[PDB]
A = this chain, B = another copy of it.
């Protein structure tokens, strides 16, 4: 109960919502855009329309009660940092954030983010790893 919450349902965020659901996990999916919230209705325990930067909507959401909260806001560094800021204020156990660039990463580190994700770069490392496995582990 109330273990995972994902804010920002783009390619990255919506993808963790789907995988979680597939794995049988309950998940809180949120976005400011309603068309996005309706797109993940069949995958989330609860899919709410909310502005993550709004300190009150965060309360109506009950976000203070989640062990992990993922901020997957995309090309909006401000909404992303602001949200992570409020989350850190609600003392959320684990806040993971998708970073847009170096600058964003630098502020997130000090803003409270426990883990920063750089999709492009990070996948680059995992692809390198798969390549190595193909030969090293020989297969």
Contacts and interface: CB of A to CB of B under 8 A. Distances in A.
* Chain A interface helix/strand/loop/mixed: helix
A134 to B, nearest CB: 7
A124 B67 CA distance: 18
Interface in A50-92: 53, 67-68, 70, 72, 77-79, 81-82, 85, 88-89
Contact of A128 (B19, B79, B103, B107): B19
Contacts of A46: none
14 contacts: A11-B121, A12-B121, A15-B128, A16-B127, A16-B131, A23-B129, A68-B131, A68-B134, A81-B81, A81-B107, A82-B106, A96-B127, A107-B111, A110-B110
